[PDB]
Design a protein around this ligand. Sequence first.
Ligand SMILES: *[C@@H]1O[C@H](CO[C@@H]2O[C@@H](C)[C@@H](O)[C@@H](O)[C@@H]2O)[C@@H](O[C@@H]2O[C@H](CO)[C@@H](O)[C@H](O)[C@H]2NC(C)=O)[C@H](O)[C@H]1NC(C)=O
Ligand SMILES: *[C@@H]1O[C@H](CO[C@@H]2O[C@@H](C)[C@@H](O)[C@@H](O)[C@@H]2O)[C@@H](O[C@@H]2O[C@H](CO)[C@@H](O)[C@H](O)[C@H]2NC(C)=O)[C@H](O)[C@H]1NC(C)=O
Ligand SMILES: COc1cc2c(cc1OC)C(=O)[C@H](CC1CCN(Cc3ccccc3)CC1)C2
Ligand SMILES: COc1cc2c(cc1OC)C(=O)[C@H](CC1CCN(Cc3ccccc3)CC1)C2
Ligand SMILES: *[C@@H]1O[C@H](CO)[C@@H](O)[C@H](O)[C@H]1NC(C)=O
Lengths: 530, 535
Amino acid sequence: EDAELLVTVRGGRLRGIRLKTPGGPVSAFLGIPFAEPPMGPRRFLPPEPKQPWSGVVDATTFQSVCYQYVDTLYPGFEGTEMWNPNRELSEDCLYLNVWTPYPRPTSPTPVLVWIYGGGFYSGASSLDVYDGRFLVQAERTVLVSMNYRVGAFGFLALPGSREAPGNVGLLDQRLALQWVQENVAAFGGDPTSVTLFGESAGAASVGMHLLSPPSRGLFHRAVLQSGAPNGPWATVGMGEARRRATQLAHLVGCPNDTELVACLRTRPAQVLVNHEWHVLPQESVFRFSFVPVVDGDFLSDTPEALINAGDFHGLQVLVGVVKDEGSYFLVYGAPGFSKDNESLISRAEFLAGVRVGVPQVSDLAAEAVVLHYTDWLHPEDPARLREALSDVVGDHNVVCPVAQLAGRLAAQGARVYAYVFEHRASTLSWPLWMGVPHGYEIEFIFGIPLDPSRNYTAEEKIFAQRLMRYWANFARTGDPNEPRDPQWPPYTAGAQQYVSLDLRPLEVRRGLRAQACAFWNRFLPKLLSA
Amino acid sequence: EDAELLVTVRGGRLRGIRLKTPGGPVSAFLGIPFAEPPMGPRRFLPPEPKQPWSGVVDATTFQSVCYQYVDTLYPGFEGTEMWNPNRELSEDCLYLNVWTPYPRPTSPTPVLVWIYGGGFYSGASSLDVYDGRFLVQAERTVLVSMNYRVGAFGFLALPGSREAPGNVGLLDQRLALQWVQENVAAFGGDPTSVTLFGESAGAASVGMHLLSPPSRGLFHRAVLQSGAPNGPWATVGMGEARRRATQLAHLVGCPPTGGNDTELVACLRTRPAQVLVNHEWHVLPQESVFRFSFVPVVDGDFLSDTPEALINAGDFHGLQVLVGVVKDEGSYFLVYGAPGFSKDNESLISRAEFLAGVRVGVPQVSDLAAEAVVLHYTDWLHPEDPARLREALSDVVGDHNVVCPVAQLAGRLAAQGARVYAYVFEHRASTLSWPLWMGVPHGYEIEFIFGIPLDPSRNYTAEEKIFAQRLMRYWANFARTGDPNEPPKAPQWPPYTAGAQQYVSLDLRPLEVRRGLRAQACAFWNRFLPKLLSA
Ligand SMILES: *[C@@H]1O[C@H](CO[C@@H]2O[C@@H](C)[C@@H](O)[C@@H](O)[C@@H]2O)[C@@H](O[C@@H]2O[C@H](CO)[C@@H](O)[C@H](O)[C@H]2NC(C)=O)[C@H](O)[C@H]1NC(C)=O
Ligand SMILES: *[C@@H]1O[C@H](CO[C@@H]2O[C@@H](C)[C@@H](O)[C@@H](O)[C@@H]2O)[C@@H](O[C@@H]2O[C@H](CO)[C@@H](O)[C@H](O)[C@H]2NC(C)=O)[C@H](O)[C@H]1NC(C)=O
Ligand SMILES: COc1cc2c(cc1OC)C(=O)[C@H](CC1CCN(Cc3ccccc3)CC1)C2
Ligand SMILES: COc1cc2c(cc1OC)C(=O)[C@H](CC1CCN(Cc3ccccc3)CC1)C2
Ligand SMILES: *[C@@H]1O[C@H](CO)[C@@H](O)[C@H](O)[C@H]1NC(C)=O
């Protein structure tokens, strides 16, 4: 038997599995329980630490995916399916995975912790695109990823109530981070060097852990990919959380918070999922029903406020976006869009599209969006309208919240690095008009192109290797840069420098869509407040 | 006596003068009375037609400049002095001028009627830069210009009252236009072919005549240079006009605030002209530039609704219009009140000075409105670069006051039947004494349109002389045909339309066609900002 694959953690003994990569083997421990199954009376409640077990837990395979909506927009299409659950759905889903070099490191190795995105309504650590084996082999880190509750199960909130306090999916993440502090050394990992990285809702999660003091002692550096806690989709107010929870109860035949939650607890998980999208107040894209709530507890204030008022000396952060953040979302609700045509929309469709991309703002606010995003020498040109609406959704939801986060953090003591990821995968099956869509840098960060059984080019493999080195350098030192030879400069509120990530050497540029983001970050709030 | 210099008009006989020009003789009839003098009891009142006279009136020199403020910002500086009165100030100022070819035209000749600018508070038809001799000689048109009352004398309004109804300066202009209809034939002019042209406040006046039915029958074509009736400086509401009128009276002791209008006006009529003028700038509610105390009032009479409304809801089929702006409409105004500015230095302002300048250049709007202006005119990759800030403030003042109002008028007119032509004037005169940072400032295309560079005593280059001849040709072609284009191989000046938005650059180089009159900027001022002010 293989002693490298036997580990004892606080709760008992584990058996892992040896995995192959083109660079040699790696040790994997998959499906380690970190909480009691949040089932029955535990639905909607904070996670409880997993009670110790006797005998040996089989950690050789991924565990169940937390209950979630399954994307059926284009049935069979690889582009949507690669994000869907690839294991059975269950509420018994609170497991985490550890990948480590082979044989296990016998000295403290820097730890990367992955938090997946999926708008807080979906995602899983078991997805192919999140395979930790290549990063661990190539960069000799320890990699941890956890499942956390999503949708109503993780984020349904009746603020003030004990039966559904909200944010429990965030607590699932915190408990996993505490698990890492207590157990990662048993795998060769160094609990004093833990870097969080996440994408979209995962990035927003990372940011929220930054702004919540009980989490802040569980890690040392942060990476936010295409997401930020201050995104207009990433939190919801107490009032609206209560309304959405109340409408869900109504839609599934339930009626006093105690009674309401008790009736919800009797419903099959799938039933809650089937009505999830229906509690959204207006037609939209890039909006999700059950998200982190600002209730004074996990988040003592809005992330915007907490950001603006924070002291971030001692912090290093890596943040960035893809080239076309908004394009992907247009096919889920914008009139005139399809992955199967050029989506060359009309001015009228563009105008309707704006209310969908920017839901629940006043007509005046919408008018201001149309003003900024119209080229008044070509107001009706379909291609420009397509690009512009992509820009609206992308700037509003991702780029400008990330820019604002980066500016405030840098101006308040943090060292920030910024990137735009500008390579379109040769294997990408979404149409060319989408450019580089949301989510499509991840496979490169994880070194998926190194997988011989996939169709990436030789250059793409080298690129993935560069990216893995940047990310792991950052985890190790707080600085992505290799030894001098073009350098990646820190982002600051003034110079606003970032690099382009693609097949070409690093290129330094200025401004994360500064003109557009001045509108979203500086002007538009003032307008709304009047 | 010389037969060419004798003309009979409806009021009596006139004797003129023979003028020399580089290209041959011109007849000029300068200082023809067209109204009874608005003296004493007639102050603030609509002009009365000049009573007929016996004998011969000598129309041989420019008459008095209408009473007005005299600009003292840079005493002795030619850049400022050239706009100041060059005849004595008098309320007895309602005279016009006719220039005609020598010998007098055998067949009816197209007429150009000039209306000077000057913010409705200043200006005169006697200024050297409005000398009509060259246009008449070069292009064989008849040229008319009139004096009209300005400042309180022309535009103080107590809306409703018969004693100061407002807009009398515009009535001065109309009376002169009626005089052109009744009398221009006697000089060989065609009353069926009359083209109005004006610059700044004169351009805005031209536009108002377009929007006022009793004026509309008096002309056929219009030219608006760097001004529009819909500019935020060009009109004022009834209540604000009354407030300014009342404050003026108060500041000069009338009555011994408000009360009976009849009495308030009667007390105002007893004040010396210069006393009114000395307090004129004091009635402006906030610190500003490009704002003038007494301007046309929207009172439902001369203007039955706002110029914006009238434009938007009008039929302009059968109308030809030529409109345009200079390259740097805003720069001139900054030295009259924007912090940090001077003609004598580079005016490389700080961000703080820029922000303060914004409130001066866009006075009396909400903090939110101002923030919207700062957003659209800040380069957020270079938010504090002094030169960029200087240029930005210039654009703010220029766009808001001139370019965007002109663009809006041009687009609405085109889309509603009018054939429209648009230019941007991009030549900086070799003789310009204002500093280089001002570029091509407000007012400095006029001298070229009038052909002033053909004046031997002046020191323009040969190219500038050639350029002047081109412009005069364009303007006269438009006057004659409603189309500035040469009736060959020469580059064509296409109509301006709401969609293509084509205009030409006018400078030493040949016509270059371009798109959009500050389109991105003007979408802010014309489409969005008004919605923000309603909410
Ligand atoms: C591009 O396609 C959109 C989406 O239409 C769907 O996908 C197409 C490939 C085709 O299979 C359609 O029949 C599908 O409905 C088109 O927008 C739709 O237009 C249809 C009428 O054909 C209308 O009933 C729907 O309301 C529209 N759907 C949306 C999302 O608004 C669009 O016309 C196509 N654009 C082109 C032709 O470039
Ligand atoms: C550029 O000039 C302005 C205007 O100041 C005047 O012109 C100068 C050439 C010089 O002769 C000054 O003394 C004149 O007053 C300057 O702005 C002024 O600054 C002074 C204090 O230094 C202040 O008292 C005035 O109020 C200011 N005037 C205005 C309109 O703000 C400006 O600072 C100069 N820029 C430079 C020198 O970089
Ligand atoms: C079912 O109804 C809806 C479903 C969705 C929306 C709106 C809906 O109704 C309004 C959206 O806005 C979502 C669009 C995203 C779906 C997942 N992908 C892939 C991805 C997953 C995880 C990380 C990065 C990329 C990005 C687009 C789904
Ligand atoms: C005395 O106080 C003020 C005086 C003025 C302003 C503000 C004032 O106080 C706030 C202005 O904004 C005016 C600035 C113009 C003066 C005349 N010139 C030349 C010109 C004349 C006629 C036509 C075209 C150009 C352009 C700038 C004057
Ligand atoms: C204002 O005073 C005059 C002068 O006596 C008078 O004729 C007029 O009727 C008065 N108006 C009013 C309404 O008091």
